[PDB]
Amino acid sequence: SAQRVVITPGEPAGSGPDLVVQLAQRAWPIELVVCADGALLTERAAMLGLPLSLLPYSPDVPAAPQPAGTLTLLPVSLRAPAISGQLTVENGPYVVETLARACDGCLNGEFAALITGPVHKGVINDAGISFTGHTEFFEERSQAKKVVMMLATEELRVALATTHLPLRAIADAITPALLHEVIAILHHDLRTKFGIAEPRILVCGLNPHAGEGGHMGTEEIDTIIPVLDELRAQGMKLNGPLPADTLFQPKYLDNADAVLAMYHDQGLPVLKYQGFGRGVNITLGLPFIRTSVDHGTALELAGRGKADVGSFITALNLAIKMIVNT
Template identity: 60%
Template sequence: MLKKSQNNVAPIIITAGEPSGIGMDIVQALATQQWPIPIVICCDKNLLRTRIKKLNNQIILLDYSSAVEQPAQQIGQLYVVHVPLVKDVSIGKPDKDNAQYVINMLSLANDGCLSGQFSALVTGPVHKGIINDAGIHFSGHTEFFAQQSNTDMVVMMLATEGLRVALVTTHLPIRELADAITKPHLSQIITILQRELQMKYGIKKPRIYVCGLNPHAGESGHMGREEIEIIEPTLHELREDGIDLIGPLPADTLFQEKYLQDADVVLAMYHDQGLPVLKYKGFGKAINITLGLPYIRTSVDHGTALDIAGTGMANSNSLFCALNEAIRMVQIQQHN
C-alpha cells in the first residue's frame, strides 16, 4: 500500500471528474507541495500525462498500487490510480461515451473508502447532463455516494470562511420542494447535521440557524403553512432533545452578521435558497461536504469550466480548500 503518513493514515483519493473539463488541469497543482497525508489521483493516467504536457508542467506520475508499499510522494510527483477512458477526449467537449468512465472513477473511490484503503475522498467537477445523456441516472455526487454506500440519508453542506450552509433538500425541481419537506425528513437531516458537526468538526454543541421555506418564514401562515405545521413543531421536538436550533427565520434577512456570528451552520430548505449567498461570499474558496456518509467526502464548489479547460487559466483554490478540509477532518477523527 502507498506509504502512510507518520500518523499511519491511509491516503486520500481525489477523482479528477469530467475528462474534458478543468478537473484534469487543477489536480496538477497538487504536485507543487507535499501533503501531511498521502494523496492519490483517480483518473486515466495517459489523459493526465497528455494534459500535463499541454500545460507545459513537469510532473512525474507514479503508479498507485494497494498491493505494495511505495515511497511517499514528493514535490513534482503525483500518485495515480488508473481508470481507463472509454473514448479519446477533446478538451472542452464532453462526450457521453465517457460517462461510464466518470462513474467508474467514483465507484472505485467509494469502494476504496468503504474498505479503508483510503481515509477520505475529494471530488473534482463532473458534468451531470452528459452522464444523464448517456442513459445513466445521476443527480449529483451527494446522491450517488449515498446510494453506493447504502446510506439512507446524507446532508449536503457547503462551506467557506465564516459561513457554512447545509441543505434540507438538494437537487430537486422547485415544484417538488414543499412535498419533500416532511417532519421525519427534517428531523433526520438536523440529527445528522448535529452529529457530524460534533464528530468531523469537533463542535461540542453546534448552533444551527434554520431558514423558513416560504417568504418571511410564512408570515404567520399568510404565505404558507409549512413553518407552522412542519418546521416549527420539528424544531421544538429536537430542542427538547438538546439540539441548539434558532428559527425558522426569513431567509432574506438571516444572512446578516448579527446572526451569522453566532451560527455554526445555516440550514436552508432548498438548494438555491442558501447556496447563492455562500457562493457569492466565497466562490473559488468554498467547498462541498457530504455529511452522513461512512467516510469523509469533500468537493470543489465549481463546475467543469469547459471554456477554459486546457488553457492554464483554471484556478485550483477550491481544490486546495477541499483537500485541506478533508485532511483536517481526518486528523480530528484520529484524535477522537
Template identity: 60%
Template sequence: MTTRPVLAITTGEPAGVGPELAVQVAAAEASRAEQLVLIGDRDLLAARAAAVGVSADWPDFVAGSAAPVSILHIPLAHPAVAGKLDPANARYVLDTLDAAIDGCLDGVFDAMVTAPIHKGVINDGCPGQFFSGHTEYLAEHTNTHQVVMMLVGGGLRVALATTHLPLADVAAALNAESLVTTLSILQADLQSKFGIAEPRILVAGLNPHAGESGHLGREEIDIIEPVLEKLRATGMQLIGPLPADTLFQPKYLQTADAVLAMYHDQGLPVLKYASFGQGVNLTLGLPIIRTSVDHGTALDLAGTGQADVGSLQAALTLAAQLAVNHRAAA
C-alpha cells in the same frame, strides 16, 4: 495504512478542468503532510499536465506506499478533448467514483475529494441510469438512507434540507421525518467531524418572511416549527425558522456554527458570493469523508491553465482536517 492521511482525488469530467486542477494541486503539494492519489486515466493526466506546464511523472498507486503523489489508473473509453463532452466516457467518470468509494470503505483511503463532473453527459452516456449528482450517487453506493449536502466557505457552513430538485417540487419534498433526520445528521457531524461539542444551528423558513404567520405559506407552522420544538427537547440548539432574506447577517451568524437552508438556491448563493473559488462541498451522513469543489466543469477553460485551483485546494485541506479528526475520535 500509513500514518499520513491518504486522500483520493477523483479527476472528474475528462473534458473539463478537473484533470488539470488535480495535477496542478498535486505538483504544487508533493511535500504536503497528506498523500494524494489521483484517480483517472494516466495519459489524460499527463497531457493536461503538459498543457499547464507541470509534470505528472508519478508512480502507480500501491496501497501502503509512502509516495506523496501517485496515480490510480482507470482508462478512458475514448480519447478526451478539452472542452468537448463525449458520452462515451460517461461510464469512466462513474468508475473513478466507484474506485474512490470502494477505497474509502475498505480503509485504503482516509477521504475522497471530487473534481467537477457533468450530470448531463453522464445521463446521456448511461441510458437507464438517472444521475442527479455526486451527493445522491455517494448515498446510493454507500447504502446510506439519507445524506446532507453542506457547503463550507467564507466563514459559513450552509447545509441543505433538499438538494437537486426543481423548485416546484421543493415544498412537497419537505416533511417532518426527513427534516428530523437532516438536522440530526448535521448535529452529529458538526460534533464528530468538526469537533463542536454543542452546535448552534440557524434554520431558515421555506416561504418569504418565514411564512408571515401562515399568510405566505404554512410549511413553517405545520412542519418546521414542530420539528424544531421536538429536537430542542433533546438538547439541540436550533434557532428559527428565520426569514432567509435576513438570516445571513452578522447578528445571527456570529454566534452560529451552521445554517440549514430549505432548498439549494436559498442558501448557496450567499455562501458562493462570500467564498466562490475557495468554497468546499461536503457530504454529511456518509460512512466515509467526501469533499468537493464548489464549481462546475468550466469547459471553456479546460486545457488553458486559467482555471483557479483555490476550491480544490480548500477541499483537500478540509478533507485532511476531517480525516485527522476522524482518526483522533476512532
C-alpha cells in the same frame, strides 16, 4: 500518520484533470491516490507545461506522503480520446466508473477520504446514466440513510435540506422525516467532524417569512416547527424557522456555527456572495469523509491552465484536517 486519500478529477473533458495536475505540483502529508485515466493526466500535464510522474497504487505497499510533481494512480481508462473542453457522451461511463472505485475504496478503509473534482450531470444523463450529483451517488452507493450537503467558507457554513432539485420539487421533498435526518446528521457532524461542542444552528423556513403563520405557506406548521421543537427538547440549539432574508444578517450569523437552508438557492447565494470562490462542498452523513469543489467543469478552460485550483486545494486541505480528527 501515513494516510491515503482518493481524488477523482471528474469530467475528463473538463478542467478537473487540469486542477489535479496543478495541485500535484506540491508535496503532501498524505498519499494522493488519483482514480482516473493515467494518459489523461499526462496529456494535460504536458499542455500545461507541468511535469508529472505517476506512481502505481497498491493497498499492500503502505501509504507514503505524495512527492511534489507526482500522484499515485488508480487506473481507469476512457472510452475515447478526451479533447480539452469537448464534452462527449462516450466517456460518461468512465466518470461514473472512477466515482464507483473511489467510493468503494473509501468504503473499504483503503482511503481515509474522498475529494472530488467537477463532473457534468448532463453528459452522464445523456449517456443513459441516472445521475443527480456526487452527493446522491455516494449516499446511494454506500446505502446511507441520509446525507447532508454543506458548503462552507472560512466565514460561513451553509447546509441544505434539499440539493439540486427543480424548484417545483422542493415543497413535497421537505418531510418531517427528512428534516429530522438532516438536522440530526448536521448537529452531529458539527460537534464531531468540526469540533463544535454545542453547535448553534440557524434554520431557514421553507416559505418567505417562514410561512408567517399560514399566510405564506403551512409547511412550517405541518413539518418544520414540529421537528425543530422535538430536537430542541433534546438539547439541540436550533433557532428557527426564520425568514431567510432576516437570518442572513451579520447580527444573526455571528452567533451561530452553521445555517440550514431548506433548498439550494435559499442559502448558497449569500455564501457565494462572500465566499471568494474558496468554498468547499462537504458531504455529511457518509461512512467516510468527502469534500469537493463547488464550481463547474469549466470546459472552455480545459487545456489552458486557466482554471483556479483555489477551491480544489481548500477542499483537499479541509479533508486532511477532518482526517486528523481521526
